[PDB]
Amino acid sequence: DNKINIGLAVMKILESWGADTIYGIPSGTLSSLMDAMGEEENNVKFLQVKHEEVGAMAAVMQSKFGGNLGVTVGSGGPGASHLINGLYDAAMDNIPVVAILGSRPQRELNMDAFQELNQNPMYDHIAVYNRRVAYAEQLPKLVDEAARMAIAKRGVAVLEVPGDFAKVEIDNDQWYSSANSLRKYAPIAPAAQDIDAAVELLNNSKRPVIYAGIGTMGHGPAVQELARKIKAPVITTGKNFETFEWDFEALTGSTYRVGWKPANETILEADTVLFAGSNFPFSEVEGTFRNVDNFIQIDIDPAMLGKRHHADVAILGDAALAIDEILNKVDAVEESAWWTANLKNIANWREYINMLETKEEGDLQFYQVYNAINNHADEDAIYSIDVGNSTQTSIRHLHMTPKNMWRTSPLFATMGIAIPGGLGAKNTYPDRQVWNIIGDGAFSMTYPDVVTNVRYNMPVINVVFSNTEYAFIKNKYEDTNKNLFGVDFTDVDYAKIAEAQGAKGFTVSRIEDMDRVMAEAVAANKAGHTVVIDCKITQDRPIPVETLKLDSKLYSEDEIKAYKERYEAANLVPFREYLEAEGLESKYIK
């Protein structure tokens, strides 16, 4: 032993924590650190992006997709501030990530020098750790603790690092990594008393429903078995569709806007809700559970117990173990009018969606684009979804199973999350098929980074929806506003831009050309090319399932007529009809 460069010590620490990829853009305030990358057999790699926000989002999405702890860097000042959308997303999603903010050298601090400023206030509100390194020798210790904190506190750990520190040398015995001491709690078994109370309520309920969030990830088969055992339909969240087999007989979808018709009707007619591993944000403001009688909640976070609705039964512990315990103790239900009515309601919805997806000719709609994806995607495909209307509606069409991964920016909802997500995913799974589904608005905030996929040979399939408008925003102008719309722009040739970036571009605007174009796009991706499919679609909006104008006791004939005509929903049948057909009555309608 002898001496070691502080920058190298930092890289050794990062590698010990599994943080082998740093995302960002090189700069003078970060050079000393980056210069240590590699050599001494270090395995930390640098992935250079075009905009630091994409680097931050990529580092975060890497973890969302099950990858290693990500690290993102931003040069002192503007580079650091550019990380904001990625860090806010991580903070709200409780995703570990280490953000390193470069800074002018120590001697320049507080001198009002060029691009010199106090960056401590920048992320203090959202960070789980936020410190300005005070002297070179403690940099290794703080990077180690930043990783430890990001992981333990499930959030953003931020370090402001003066650019001269990494150049300093220290004794090899003056630093260490605590990665070897990394420990995590194994799934914890729920209290028998709480499981028992839940079992009693479920046994005595006439209309049970399972509302499963990502806390049930990895336990879809068990949840489906419980659903079948007690004849309780399943409602999922916008983040948890992959947990279920897309064609599961009792899957009603999700509630509210980015949801399905069945789920939205089921929740208003349910009696007992098993809220498993969810923190559904629309709960209170949209009155999701306004008609429920009993509410059972399962969660590993005590801060969540009884948060979204009063909980008659609270179960603290792992959702897997809890579901298994409930499954073993609850009584089996052979026949149920409630179950039968729900199955028919779901089937009716699937008929509608299938009809839209399988059209043969005409102006392209996003429905058929999703159909093409289903017909050509690998069974274990990864989906990086952006936040627009046409992209979030993907959960109504993608035929996913737990073999897939579907991730977005679900709560903070930052636009432009797709491309960075694709980078994080492909970096983690180089041999796996990765799709980025993006709307024109979101694409326009991040398409310069398509070149990043090209440069690093991380081939992804970019599916871009171009409608010259904004469906999502076109939905918030007919529910609170009164004046005319106004969200129509020009016609940018994204395929041409892709070609200019070294990617392969395709343009499609007809349903009859979609299958061929998708096949060619997939084949090109398999040849190692990043592709951009510019889908010139119509201005059609996904049917608003939060405002179902189908029940003749809730809306007028004219309203139902116009609703059916606009969304091609002539064959959709209101849930009450299915309930009454099985001898039941609506608990709230009339």
* By CB under 6 A, residue 254 contacts ligand FAD: yes
Token representation of residue 25: 């853009």
Quick one: what does residue 2 bind among ligand FAD, its own copies, none, with the CB cut-off 5 to 8 Å set by partner type?
A: none
> Per-residue x/- marks for its own copies, 113-142, CB under 8 A?
xxxxxx-xxx-xx----xxxxxx--x--xx
User: Of 8 and 319, which has the nearer Cβ to ligand FAD?
Assistant: 319
* By CB under 8 A, residue 401 contacts its own copies: no
In the region spanning residues 491 to 530, those forming contacts with its own copies, defined by CB under 8 A, are 492-494, 496-497, 499-502
**Residue spans of beta strands (DSSP E) within 392-528:** 405-407, 434-439, 461-466, 504-508
> Using CA atoms, how far apart are residues 447 and 532, in angstroms rounded to an integer?
10
Quick one: what does residue 376 bind among its own copies, ligand FAD, none, with the CB cut-off 5 to 8 Å set by partner type?
A: none
* By CB under 6 A, residue 554 contacts ligand FAD: no
* By CB under 6 A, residue 130 contacts ligand FAD: no
Q: Which stretch binds ligand FAD (CB under 6 A): 207-215, 336-344, 458-466, 484-492?
A: 207-215
Token representation of residue 315: 């179960």
Q: Which of 4, 304, 382, 569 binds ligand FAD (CB under 6 A)?
A: 304
* By CB under 8 A, residue 480 contacts its own copies: yes
Cβ-Cβ contacts under 8 Å for 286 (sequence gap 6 or more): 255, 256, 546
* By CB under 6 A, residue 265 contacts ligand FAD: no
Q: Which of 55, 96, 155, 163 binds its own copies (CB under 8 A)?
A: 163
> Per-residue x/- marks for its own copies, 182-211, CB under 8 A?
xxxx--x--x--x-----------------
Other C-beta atoms lying within 10 Å of the C-beta of residue 258: 24
User: Of 259 and 459, which has the nearer Cβ to ligand FAD?
Assistant: 259
Torsion of CA 425, 429, 435, 438, to 10 degrees: 10
Q: Where are the alpha helices (DSSP H) in 333-417?
A: 337-357, 366-376, 389-392
> Using CA atoms, how far apart are residues 129 and 131, in angstroms rounded to an integer?
7
* By CB under 6 A, residue 279 contacts ligand FAD: yes
Q: Please name every residue paired with 536 in a beta bridge, in sequence order, or none if there are none.
A: 466
User: Of 285 and 332, which has the nearer Cβ to its own copies?
Assistant: 285
548 secondary structure, DSSP code: -
Q: Are 82 and 54 in contact (CB under 8 A)?
A: no
Other C-beta atoms lying within 10 Å of the C-beta of residue 456: 16
* By CB under 8 A, residue 82 contacts its own copies: yes
User: Of 274 and 319, which has the nearer Cβ to ligand FAD?
Assistant: 319
* By CB under 8 A, residue 84 contacts its own copies: yes
Q: Of 343, 344, 368, 346, give the one whose Cα is nearest residue 355.
A: 368
DSSP string, 270-285: -SEEEEES---TTTTT
Classified as helix, coil or strand, 232 is coil
Site residues for ligand FAD per CB under 6 A: 114, 213-215, 237-240, 254-259, 277-281, 298-301, 304, 318-319, 387, 392, 408, 410-411, 413
